[PDB]
């Protein structure tokens, strides 16, 4: 089986659980305020910082390199804008760094440092969602919180260097299928993607509790 297909099949169940998390149910209904939203975007700041640092460490590694798309995909600069929007000029000292975020970041460094053949599972889990349900979350955020169409506060959800998310996702999928793939690597990559989803589910369960 192609890796792109293996990953979708492996994560289709946990994806259902993730999109139906209590935090996300509240989001999709429109119940999340500025406070909740600042919490999740600050958490994403740390996650994508760790993820993109590990992507840089491994950019020339053949186990990842075909998926190296900083210009199109990387979120850190965009999140730095959003942090300045939501938290102001001294956001680096203002933003929270929660335990679940720390746990997620810790795994990203373990993977990037010790198991870079699995890094694709983590880039997959975040980026392809950003290019999918991410786009729906963006419209909900705009409506709920009165965020302007011009895009301030929602740079994270904006991909100026991609014309069509759907087309780019097809490209990224075909490119995943180009990675050197053994039964050993494909088994562990699909397992690591399931873990990536759980780390996200646990972040969202934590934030929901912090707010209630």
From Swiss-Prot:
One BP annotation, GO: negative regulation of ferroptosis
Keyword vocabulary terms for this entry: Apoptosis, Endoplasmic reticulum, Heme, Iron, Membrane, Metal-binding, Oxidoreductase, Phosphoprotein, Transmembrane, Transmembrane helix
Disulfide bonds, paired cysteine numbers: none
Catalytic reaction annotation: heme b + 3 reduced [NADPH--hemoprotein reductase] + 3 O2 = biliverdin IXalpha + CO + Fe(2+) + 3 oxidized [NADPH--hemoprotein reductase] + 3 H2O + H(+)
Chain positions of site Important for catalytic activity: 130
Residues involved in heme b binding: 8, 15, 124, 173
Top class in the EC scheme: oxidoreductase
Cytoplasmic side: 1-212
Annotated compartments: Endoplasmic reticulum membrane
EC number(s) from the headed UniProt entry: 1.14.14.18
Membrane protein topology class: Single-pass type IV membrane protein
A molecular function (GO) term: heme binding
Induction remark: Induced by its substrate heme and CoCl2.
Post-translational modification comment from the UniProt entry: A soluble form arises by proteolytic removal of the membrane anchor.
Activity regulation, free text: Inhibited by metalloporphyrins such as Sn- and Zn-protoporphyrins.
GO cellular component assignments: caveola; cytosol; endoplasmic reticulum; endoplasmic reticulum membrane; nucleus; perinuclear region of cytoplasm
Family membership: Belongs to the heme oxygenase family.
Comment block on domains: The transmembrane domain is necessary for its oligomerization.
Subunit structure, interactors included: Homodimer and higher order homooligomer. Oligomerization is crucial for its stability and function in the endoplasmic reticulum. Interacts with FLVCR2; this interaction is potentiated in the presence of heme.
The protein's name in its UniProt record: Heme oxygenase 1
Organism: Rattus norvegicus
Gene that specifies this protein: Hmox1
């Amino acid at each position: 089986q192609d890796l792109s297909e293996a990953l979708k099949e492996a994560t289709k169940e946990v994806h259902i659980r993730a999109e139906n998390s209590e935090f996300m149910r509240n989001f999709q209904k429109g119940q999340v305020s500025r406070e909740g939203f600042k919490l999740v975007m600050a958490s994403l700041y740390h996650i994508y910082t760790a993820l993109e640092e590990e992507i840089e460490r491994n950019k020339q590694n053949p186990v990842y390199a075909p998926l190296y798309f900083p210009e199109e995909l990387h979120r850190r600069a965009a999140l730095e804008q959003d942090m300045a929007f939501w938290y102001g000029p001294h956001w680096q000292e203002a933003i929270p760094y929660t335990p679940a975020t720390q746990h997620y970041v810790k795994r990203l460094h373990e993977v990037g440092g010790t198991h870079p053949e699995l890094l694709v599972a983590h880039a997959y889990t975040r980026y392809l969602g950003d290019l999918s349900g991410g786009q729906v979350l963006k419209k909900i955020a705009q409506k709920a919180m009165a965020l302007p169409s011009s895009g301030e506060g929602l740079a994270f959800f904006t991909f100026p260097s991609i014309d069509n998310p759907t087309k780019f996702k097809q490209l990224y999928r075909a490119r995943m299928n180009t990675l050197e793939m053994t039964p050993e690597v494909k088994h562990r990559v699909t397992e690591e993607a399931k873990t990536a989803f759980l780390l996200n589910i646990e972040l969202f369960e934590e934030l929901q509790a912090l707010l209630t």
